[PDB]
């Protein structure tokens, strides 16, 4: 685990921490209740009063890793507040120099990310009960009945299916190399049969978060300032950094599963030109960088497109087709998702741009079909 790959949960955090250190325990508060620090307008003043707390007092790894979740999510609310239309284009050098350092020491941006706020972002109720939804809770959201359970829950939820298929990928490269036909073709076909079993678990979506609420909530808080005509040059990181500084939301689109198997799949998604492309391969660098580096690996690796391709073997192109297939599958379900739940709402030339964007990624991941 040198790629901080779990076999149980696969790129999430297995069980994050839940308190920080008490040299930080201004954070934890001003973090653990900000439904009432924006429902109220003394958030943005309780940041100002703040000390400019040094990073050395946090020892571990998932110290600082709830450290980035707390100082994002606070973050966040600061810069955009109650989400009415009033911003700040500027931010404290109390939150700025010990968010921008410690964005320095996981090599991640200074802004909430994926990694922290669904990732990092989760507690287990019942530590002996199973993973499911009723029996897990995040650990941070920004308003109430925003359904920051269902969106951050149900994310975490899919990257733990998928853990499933992606300790399967081992086997697929040894089997390569051994000349072991047989057992390439079952693991081919167990990352095809988990990639199944995680389109279920996308369902989910629909029984536990809001259209409504989600598109008029919780993306303002997710939505960062890169191309972003509301810091339109970008946000001042005060203390750390001479200028304004751009740098983007924290969607979905910076998990590593989708990419994972596009890179398994010899899918060249981040070929061609095009901002289908430069997204995805641009995205890497709001993931981890131990996860940056796992995808870097597969890359590294022969190619199983080119290995099945090269045997002449209904069996092989069949199961690998299975793999390509759950992979559009769940895109070409990910929409059904986006229209419901941005293109609907945002109605009560941008809207079309997101969805060619998405289906050209979808359509890439169809063209790689053996069939
Ligand atoms: C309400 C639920 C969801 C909405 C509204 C949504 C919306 C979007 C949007 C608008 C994008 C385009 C990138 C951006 O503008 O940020 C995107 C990309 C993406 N989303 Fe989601 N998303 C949702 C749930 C999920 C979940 C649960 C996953 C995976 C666990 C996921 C995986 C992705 C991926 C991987 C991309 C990058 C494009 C790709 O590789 O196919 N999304 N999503």
Redesign the pocket.
Known sequence: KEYHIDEEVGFALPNPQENLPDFYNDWMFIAKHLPDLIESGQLRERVEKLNMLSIDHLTDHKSQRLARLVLGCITMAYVWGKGHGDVRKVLPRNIAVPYCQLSKKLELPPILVYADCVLANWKKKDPNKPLTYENMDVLFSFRDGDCSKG?FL??LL??IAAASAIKVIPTVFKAMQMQERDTLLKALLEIASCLEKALQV?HQ?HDH?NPKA?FSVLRIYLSGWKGNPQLSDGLVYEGFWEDPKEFA?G???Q?S???CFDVLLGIQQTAGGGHAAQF?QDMRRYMPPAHRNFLCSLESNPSVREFVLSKGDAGLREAYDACVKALVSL?SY?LQ??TK??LIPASQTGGTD?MN??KT?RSTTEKSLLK
């Open positions: 969106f149900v994310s899919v990257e996308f979506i978060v989600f939301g969607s979905a689109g998990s599963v989708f990419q995805l895109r990910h998702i986006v739940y941005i997101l964007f998405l990624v």
